[PDB]
Write an enzyme that holds these catalytic residues in place. Structure first.
Site, PDB file in Angstrom:
ATOM      1  N   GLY A 129       0.812  -1.206   0.000  1.00  0.00           N
ATOM      2  CA  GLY A 129       0.000   0.000   0.000  1.00  0.00           C
ATOM      3  C   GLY A 129       0.848   1.259   0.000  1.00  0.00           C
ATOM      4  CG  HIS A 179      -6.007  -1.115  -0.120  1.00  0.00           C
ATOM      5  ND1 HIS A 179      -7.122  -1.821   0.290  1.00  0.00           N
ATOM      6  CD2 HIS A 179      -5.019  -1.438   0.747  1.00  0.00           C
ATOM      7  CE1 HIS A 179      -6.825  -2.522   1.367  1.00  0.00           C
ATOM      8  NE2 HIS A 179      -5.558  -2.306   1.668  1.00  0.00           N
ATOM      9  N   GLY A 180      -9.476  -1.042  -2.019  1.00  0.00           N
ATOM     10  CA  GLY A 180     -10.831  -0.828  -1.516  1.00  0.00           C
ATOM     11  C   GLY A 180     -11.248  -1.901  -0.524  1.00  0.00           C
ATOM     12  CG  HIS A 239      -8.049  -5.798   3.835  1.00  0.00           C
ATOM     13  ND1 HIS A 239      -6.818  -5.937   3.233  1.00  0.00           N
ATOM     14  CD2 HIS A 239      -8.785  -6.865   3.440  1.00  0.00           C
ATOM     15  CE1 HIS A 239      -6.807  -7.045   2.509  1.00  0.00           C
ATOM     16  NE2 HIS A 239      -7.989  -7.625   2.617  1.00  0.00           N
ATOM     17  CE1 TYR A 245      -5.979   0.221   6.953  1.00  0.00           C
ATOM     18  CE2 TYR A 245      -6.072  -1.613   5.414  1.00  0.00           C
ATOM     19  CZ  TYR A 245      -5.568  -1.035   6.571  1.00  0.00           C
ATOM     20  OH  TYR A 245      -4.649  -1.706   7.359  1.00  0.00           O
ATOM     21  N   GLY A 274       0.315 -13.629   0.138  1.00  0.00           N
ATOM     22  CA  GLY A 274       0.854 -12.604   1.018  1.00  0.00           C
ATOM     23  C   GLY A 274       1.980 -13.090   1.921  1.00  0.00           C
ATOM     24  CE1 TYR A 295       2.386  -5.183   8.850  1.00  0.00           C
ATOM     25  CE2 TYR A 295       2.217  -6.101  11.045  1.00  0.00           C
ATOM     26  CZ  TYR A 295       1.754  -6.011   9.763  1.00  0.00           C
ATOM     27  OH  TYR A 295       0.649  -6.763   9.408  1.00  0.00           O
TER      28      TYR A 295
END
Ligand code: FMN
Ligand code: HBA
Length: 374
Positions: free
Chosen positions: A56, A177-178, A180, A182, A331, A359
């Site tokens: 992202g 990105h549409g 999860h 967000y 992923g 992360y």
């Protein structure tokens, strides 16, 4: 005949196999600039005719909800992406940039001037969920500020510009990105969207924002360079809809109609599905329901369909073989297996992945130092 390892014409692009790098936030783009760590990361995972989708990528300063994630709204960022894209292309990869706005899934520390995150709604994500902060502690999701209609149009413009910048960087295309929970999912999901205006209520109103985004980026760079990701049945960060099947079909009917109207197909539809296993991989009821949902959505969408979410070698093979999907994205396995395509082809063991360095910010540790077979 279509198999997981057979070639595919994804409209404008030719792929040599159906294994796709799923978009994965990794937080190694220090101060939002793509860098030599990202170059090696994507280069490691590149194959001739293999499709890659980036982590992202911020479309604006208000887009961020993680530390050290890349943006594509400044010249400096574009210049950084050029190096990533050139390296991927040198390996023969096809690469799309995922355009990401987190909406209410953010914190004042991530926002310009410490402003409230924006959303469809004034309702915050519940305390059942916590957000990773830049100082490696976890914080509370704050009350977001609901966008006025004119502000929504400003965000559409941000997507448009981001798409143009992606093409300047040499990207083959972009993914909206549409999914999860967000920003765009905050409008689609009736569990979140409590608006009473033209962007709330009916499926028509709830799908308006994401369709405006799809229309804008298609106008800017072409339908055939635009992919869209949704997740009607994933509940992440209080993002539920009362009727995921209908929500998914509503989005799809609108994509089909837009394609028919404009005279061309989008690059693909990309749908992530929930899993019901202990580790979130593979299959165990809810499972069978989810599986049928995905087949129903596939069948209804006119064009290329990418599935994602807990796929394994066997499930990926079945998905393509039985016609349930054209492409399969991975992923977590791609985190720890840079040469995942090769490993799948050889039925080799897959490296375990370490969630503790998903992360963190080191350019090497837990990022580029998972071994390939060679
Ligand atoms: C560390 C991590 C980062 C992720 N980042 C993104 C992202 O930036 N954009 C996105 O659409 N999905 C993201 N995802 C979701 C993945 O794309 C994928 O759908 C999910 O991990 C389920 O697929 P898998 O079982 O193959 O891992 C991320 C997942 C993980 C574990
Ligand atoms: O879907 C987007 C996403 C971003 C970061 C994550 O950790 C997981 C998912």
């Amino acid at each position: 005949k279509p198999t997981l390892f057979s070639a595919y014409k994804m409209g404008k692009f030719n792929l040599s196999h159906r294994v796709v790098l799923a978009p994965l936030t990794r937080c190694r783009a220090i101060n939002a600039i793509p860098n030599e760590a990202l170059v090696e990361y994507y280069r490691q995972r590149s194959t001739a005719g293999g499709f890659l989708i980036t982590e992202g990528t911020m479309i604006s300063p208000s887009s961020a909800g993680f530390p050290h994630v890349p943006g594509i709204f400044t010249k400096e960022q574009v210049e950084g992406w050029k190096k990533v894209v050139d390296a991927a292309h040198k390996e023969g990869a096809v690469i799309f940039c995922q355009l990401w706005h987190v909406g209410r899934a953010s914190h004042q520390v991530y926002q310009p001037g410490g402003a409230a995150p924006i959303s469809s709604t004034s309702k915050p994500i519940s305390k059942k969920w916590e957000i990773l902060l830049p100082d490696a502690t976890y914080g509370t999701y704050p009350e977001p500020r609901p966008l006025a209609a004119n502000e929504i149009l400003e965000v559409v413009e941000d997507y448009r510009v981001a798409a143009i910048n992606a093409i300047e960087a040499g990207f083959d295309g972009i993914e909206i990105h549409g999914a999860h929970g967000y920003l765009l999912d905050q409008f689609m999901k009736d569990g979140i969207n409590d608006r009473t205006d033209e962007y709330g209520g009916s499926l028509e109103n709830r799908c308006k924002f994401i369709l405006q985004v799809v229309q804008a980026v298609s106008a800017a760079i072409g339908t055939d360079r635009v992919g869209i990701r949704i997740s009607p049945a994933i509940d992440h960060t209080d993002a539920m809809d009362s009727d995921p099947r209908s929500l998914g079909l509503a989005v799809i009917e609108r994509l089909n109609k837009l394609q028919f109207k404009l005279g061309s197909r989008l690059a693909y539809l990309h749908v992530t599905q929930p899993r019901y296993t202990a580790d979130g991989h593979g299959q165990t009821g809810s499972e069978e329901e989810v599986a049928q949902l995905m087949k129903t959505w596939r069948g209804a969408y006119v064009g290329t369909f990418i599935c994602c979410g807990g796929y394994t070698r066997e499930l990926g093979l079945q998905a393509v073989a039985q016609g349930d999907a054209d492409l399969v994205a991975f992923g977590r396995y791609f985190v720890s297996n840079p040469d995942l395509v090769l490993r799948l082809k050889l039925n080799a063991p897959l490296n375990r992945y370490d969630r503790a360095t998903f992360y963190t910010h080191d350019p090497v540790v837990g990022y580029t130092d998972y071994p390939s077979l060679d």
